[PDB]
């Protein structure tokens, strides 16, 4: 098992853990802020997903400082994880293209 694949696997696991902790910590940051919607666990999990993917519909979003901090970690984990998958696909294609060229 080559490095770029172990890392893509590791990244994906690590993102799922960030999604779960982020859901949990978002609700804990946002309860106590009047008007907040990010305040029950099921939809916080959906919110962490659509944040990690950078979709950001706008149905849900943090309004407190620490919910916004949790959001940033989730965004970075998500962009980084998907970028690491992209970089692993690059490595696979580049290796395959070496062989196909006899290099």
């Amino acid at each position, epitope marked *: 098992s080559a490095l770029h694949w172990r890392a893509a696997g590791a990244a994906t696991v690590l993102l799922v853990i960030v999604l779960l902790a982020g859901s*949990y910590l978002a*609700v*804990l940051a*946002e*309860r*106590g*802020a*009047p*008007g*907040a*919607q990010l*305040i*029950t*666990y*099921p939809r916080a999990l959906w919110w962490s997903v659509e944040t990690a993917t950078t979709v950001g519909y706008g149905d849900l979003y943090p309004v407190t400082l620490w919910g916004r901090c949790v959001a940033v970690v989730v965004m970075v984990a998500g962009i980084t994880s998907f970028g690491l998958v992209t970089a692993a696909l690059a490595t696979w294609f580049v290796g395959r293209e070496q062989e196909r060229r006899g290099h």
Partner: antibody, heavy 118, light 108 residues
């Protein structure tokens, strides 16, 4: 099973304070919140506050004067509300309720009748 | 904070007739409304969650409908045990709030 257990009654002299208890049984999750709800005679339900025992974070109703203070004892599965400096306006039935972090109060205590008098 | 309006405060129906309780939210709250029954000297009891979802242990008689700002709790064929106060509660925005409640009264 009875999932939340509360004492039937507390009498409190005016200006004094009282700690209300709520011992939980059944399933307890890291995610569970314990809520407190006040009901004055002839009146409706009034949301007072909430605490998450696993992390110890608590929130309070702002719209009403803040006499309360919420703690939990993870070891005893018991949540406490300290109402301090009480008046006749604080005499009420105080319920505790359990919410699994999904927004509704699935189970309630029998409530503690708190009477302020001399 | 979200104000929940329950009106009328009292509802008089005849035995076995359909009855409908109204809950109105001061702004759209999706389907994040739950309904509680409180009998004389009792504590509240969850009847319906998320506007229309059945709770096991609760007679089929009870139903819920609505979304947005207008919500209804319905009893098809009232009977005496249904004599209680009925409260709605929203969990869409912090803090959770309750409606002021509606009493069911039966004209027998």
């Amino acid at each position: 099973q009875v999932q939340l257990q509360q004492p039937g009654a507390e009498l409190v002299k005016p200006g004094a304070s009282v700690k209300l208890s709520c011992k939980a049984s059944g399933y307890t999750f890291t995610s569970d919140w314990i809520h407190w709800v006040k009901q004055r005679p002839g009146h409706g339900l009034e949301w007072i506050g909430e605490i998450i025992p696993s992390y110890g974070r608590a929130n309070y109703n702002e719209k009403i004067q803040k006499k309360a203070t919420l703690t939990a004892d993870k070891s005893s599965s018991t949540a406490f509300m300290q109402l301090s400096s009480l008046t006749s306006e604080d005499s009420a039935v105080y319920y505790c309720a359990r919410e699994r972090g999904d927004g509704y109060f699935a189970v309630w205590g029998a409530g503690t009748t708190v009477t302020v008098s001399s | 904070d979200i104000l929940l309006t329950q009106s009328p405060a009292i509802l008089s129906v005849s035995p076995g007739e359909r009855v409908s309780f109204s809950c109105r939210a001061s702004q759209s709250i999706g389907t994040d409304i739950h309904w509680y029954q409180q009998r004389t000297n009792g504590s509240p009891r969850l009847l319906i969650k998320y506007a229309s979802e059945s709770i096991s242990g609760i007679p089929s008689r009870f139903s819920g409908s609505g979304s947005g700002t207008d919500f209804t709790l319905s009893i098809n064929s009232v009977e005496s045990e249904d004599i209680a106060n009925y409260y709605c509660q929203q969990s869409n925005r912090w803090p959770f709030t309750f409606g002021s409640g509606t009493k069911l009264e039966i004209k027998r």
